Each structure stands twice: as C-alpha cells, then as structure tokens.
C-alpha cells in the first residue's frame, strides 16, 4: 500500500527507538550484575537495514496462512571495575534521556503526518 510507504520510515524509527530504549533500560537495571557487558545497537545502521516476506499461498479456505516469527554491539568500557561490570551510569543516563527525547520527536512527526493526511480528507 502507498500509505505504508509514506509512514514506513517514521514507524521503523519509532520501533527502533523503543527497542533501543528497552536495551538501555536493561543496561541500567543490570548495572550491579558482576560480569554483565553493556550492550547497545547502532541506530542508523539498523534503520538502514529495516528500511531496505513471502506469505505462503492459500489454495482454499481450510489451508492455513503463513505464520510469522537486530544485532547488539558491546559498549566500549571507560573505567575498569573489579567485578567485570562495564555499565557506566553517566553515559547510559544521557543516552536514555536522548532516546526518550527522540521517541517523543518521532511521535510528534508521525502524528503531524497522520493529522495532515486527515485534514486533507475532512470535508
């Protein structure tokens, strides 16, 4: 559908921001686990990958339709801890706040596009 193509980029950006938000909050929650590595995703490359499948064929009514079913990069440690935990509070707190801001911005842009498509139709 053409409607999907217009809203594909913002939807994928919003979903990627939510996933990275979950990853950052997991990094915050597991700050005290000894031996836990701080993981993160490269937002731009994954957004390229998602932006850049074959529903199985249903011959009749009984035939069952096809059933549907990111890469994590390690953060470079800054300070060496003794328990092997590489999670840094300041870095991930700033990243968490930034991801929240960008999620809000994506919501704003997507809502503006939908509202414009709506006022085009209203009449």
């Amino acid at each position: 559908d053409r409607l999907d193509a217009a809203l594909r980029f913002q939807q994928e950006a919003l979903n990627l921001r939510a996933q990275r938000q979950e990853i950052l909050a997991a990094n915050i929650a597991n700050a005290d686990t000894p031996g836990y590595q701080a993981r993160d995703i490269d937002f731009a490359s994954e957004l390229k990958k998602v932006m850049v499948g074959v529903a199985l064929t249903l011959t009749s009514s009984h035939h069952i339709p096809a059933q549907a079913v990111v890469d994590l990069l390690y953060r470079v440690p800054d300070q060496p801890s003794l328990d092997g935990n590489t999670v840094d509070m300041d870095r991930e707190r700033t990243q968490f706040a930034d991801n929240s801001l960008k999620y809000q911005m994506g919501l704003t842009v997507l809502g503006s596009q939908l509202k414009g498509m709506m006022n085009v139709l209203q009449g």
Partner: protein, 50 residues
C-alpha cells in the same frame, strides 16, 4: 411328480403398502494417521532444556 389334483396349495401374503423415504450419510473414520487426509497442518514444537 405328485400328479394332477393330488396336490393343493394356498398362499397368504403380508405386504408393505407404507411409503418410506430414507437418506443415509456415512463418514469414513480418520482417527488413524495412515488413512487420514489433510488439507492444512500447523505443528509448533518447542523444547527449552535447562
């Protein structure tokens, strides 16, 4: 064999003058996997051994 007149027989008949109509439906059993005919089959299998 017995001869003309050396035999007499009489017959009575209970007849059927009742109009009956019947429709029969039969389904072949398919409980055995060998004779079971299938159109679509979804088999989700999961084994999380710890």
């Amino acid at each position: 064999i017995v001869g003309n007149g050396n035999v007499h027989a009489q017959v009575t008949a209970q007849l059927d003058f009742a109009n009956k109509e019947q429709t029969e439906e039969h389904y072949s059993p398919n409980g055995d996997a060998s004779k079971a005919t299938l159109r679509s089959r979804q088999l989700n299998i999961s084994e999380q051994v710890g």
